[PDB]
Ligand binder design. Structure first.
Ligand SMILES: Nc1ncnc2c1ncn2[C@@H]1O[C@H](COP(=O)(O)OP(=O)(O)OP(=O)(O)O)[C@@H](O)[C@H]1O
Lengths: 88, 54
């Protein structure tokens, strides 16, 4: 399913700072080429529990249209030696 | 659970365990009801006045 991207509200500023990393360098790597700066990668979302840090990621992954891997961090550990190494 | 102060906030909070139901000690009147459903199973008499014991 899909969740609207205004259905997340009150945090309209954090939605725009996340798009500065994810939306922008996908379409226009020509703008980051002008200044001469290497595009940013790697975003860390952190805050008090329940603020909506998962909701923000959920909405933006149904919207953008790029291929999307979703991974519970603890779901890729395996018993066998180094099998957890092959997954990542 | 019997220690709720210990569990961290990601296990609690609404949207996970919405309701947080507290259990109070049986009140002086409840003691009367309680003693009376456990005694039915064994022999009773009319000597007993459960109101006293509660
Ligand atoms: N900013 C918000 N606007 C509207 N609803 C919100 C917002 N933040 C949270 N919610 C509500 O909270 C629900 C779940 O919150 P969410 O799971 O995003 O918290 P979380 O920060 O991911 O929790 P955790 O720390 O356990 O990962 C959503 O389905 C929504 O109903």
């Amino acid at each position: 399913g899909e969740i609207t991207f205004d259905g997340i509200g009150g945090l309209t500023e954090q939605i725009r700072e996340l798009r500065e990393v994810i939306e922008l360098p996908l379409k226009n790597p020509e703008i980051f080429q002008r200044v001469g700066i290497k595009p940013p990668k790697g975003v860390l979302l952190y805050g008090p529990p329940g603020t909506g840090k998962t909701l923000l990621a959920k909405a933006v992954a149904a919207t953008i249209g790029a291929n999307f891997i979703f991974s519970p961090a603890s779901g890729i550990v395996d018993k066998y030696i180094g099998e957890s190494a092959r997954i990542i | 659970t019997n220690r709720v102060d210990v569990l961290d906030p990601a296990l609690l909070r609404s949207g996970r365990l919405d309701r947080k139901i507290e259990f109070p000690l049986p009140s002086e009147d409840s003691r009367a009801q309680i003693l009376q459903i456990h005694s039915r199973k064994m022999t009773t008499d009319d000597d007993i006045n459960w109101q006293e014991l509660a």
